[PDB]
């Protein structure tokens, strides 16, 4: 151990954009970090590779991780279907925060978002579990394919993903 590092290679209608890497806070939210880690390697036989960022809102966040329905209504965890909010120790303090999307309390599956700003109104509502390490420039590039309601102007996909260490 040590907190693990995962990467995504991002593409735009298939054209490579670049690599984003994340530190996952297994020291504070081990169950949540492990879900995202395993979905990033695909070790359970499903996961993030090939999925899209379906909702990108400039100045707010980039949301993805629905690998089952590919529209924001789907996705599942490595623990069945959904799991509890683990804790809310960490806060949405600024750009680069990685946090769990949900449909209300205790409905974590696979969907997640990457903040591009401080979003303190999500504190206590979404479980923060990591941060961007490398590639914030790529997140900023992704953000530019979003819109105010979150519809993307091109398809923003996870071409590849996995664990770095
Ligand atoms: C910024 C994260 O957004 C979400 O998790 C999301 O999709 N929703 C927020 C919670 C209610 C349903 C809609």
Q: Quick one: 34 exposed, middle or buried, by C-beta within 10 A (0-12, 13-18, 19+)? A: middle
User: Which atom number of ligand 1 is nearest to the Cα of residue 119?
Assistant: 1
Residue 79 and residue 106: Cα distance in Å, rounded? 13
HSE of 126, CA atoms in CB hemisphere, 13 A: 26
How far is Cα of residue 55 from the mean position of the Cα atoms in its chain?
11
Residue 139 and residue 22: Cα distance in Å, rounded? 12
| Residues known to be catalytic | 55, 60, 63, 102, 113, 122, 126
Which protein residue's CA is at the shortest distance from atom 12 of ligand 1? 103
Q: Please, which residues have CB within 8 angstroms of residue 21's CB and are 6 or more apart in sequence?
A: 5, 6, 7, 8, 132, 133, 134, 135, 164
Helix (H, G, I), strand (E, B) or coil at 142: helix
Q: Single out the residue of 5, 43, 17, 6 nearest to residue 156, CA to CA.
A: 17
Experimentally determined by: X-ray
Resolution in A: 1.6
Which residues partner with 33 through β-bridges?
none
Residues 34 and 26 sit within 8 Å (Cβ to Cβ)? yes
Q: Does the beta carbon of 97 lie inside 6 Å of ligand 1?
A: no
| CATH number for the domain whose boundaries are 1-165 | 2.40.100.10
Q: Does the beta carbon of 73 lie inside 6 Å of ligand 1?
A: no
Round the CA-based radius of gyration of the chain to a whole number and report it. 14
Where do the domains of the chain lie? 1-165
Which protein residue's CA is at the shortest distance from atom 10 of ligand 1? 103
Helix (H, G, I), strand (E, B) or coil at 109: coil
Q: Single out the residue of 119, 121, 115 nearest to residue 96, CA to CA.
A: 115
33 sits in which H/E element = helix 30-41
Q: In what order do the strands lie in the sheet with 112-115?
A: 55-57, 61-64, 112-115, 97-100, 128-132, 15-24, 5-12, 156-163
Helix (H, G, I), strand (E, B) or coil at 9: strand
Residue 125 and residue 5: Cα distance in Å, rounded? 24
DSSP codes of every residue in 37-82: HHHHHTTTS--STT-B--EEETTTEEEE---SSSSSS----TTSS-
The counts of H helices and E strands in the chain are: 2, 8
Q: Does the beta carbon of 101 lie inside 6 Å of ligand 1?
A: yes
Which protein residue's CA is at the shortest distance from atom 13 of ligand 1? 103
Q: Quick one: 66 exposed, middle or buried, by C-beta within 10 A (0-12, 13-18, 19+)? A: buried
CA of 1 to the centre of ligand 1 (A): 31
């Amino acid at each position: 151990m040590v907190n693990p590092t995962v990467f995504f290679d991002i593409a735009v209608d298939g054209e490579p954009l670049g690599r984003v890497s994340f530190e996952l806070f297994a020291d504070k939210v081990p169950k949540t970090a492990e879900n995202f880690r395993a979905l990033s390697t695909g070790e359970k036989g499903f996961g993030y590779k090939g999925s899209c960022f379906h909702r990108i809102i400039p100045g707010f966040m980039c949301q993805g991780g629905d690998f089952t329905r590919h529209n924001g209504t789907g996705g599942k965890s490595i623990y069945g279907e959904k799991f509890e909010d683990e804790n809310f120790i960490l806060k949405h303090t600024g750009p680069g925060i990685l946090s769990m999307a949900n449909a209300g309390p205790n409905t974590n599956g696979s969907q997640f978002f990457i903040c591009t700003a401080k979003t303190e109104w999500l504190d206590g509502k979404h479980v923060v579990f990591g941060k961007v390490k490398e590639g914030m420039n790529i997140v900023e590039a992704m953000e530019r394919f979003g819109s105010r309601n979150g519809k993307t102007s091109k398809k923003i996909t996870i071409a590849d993903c996995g664990q770095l260490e």
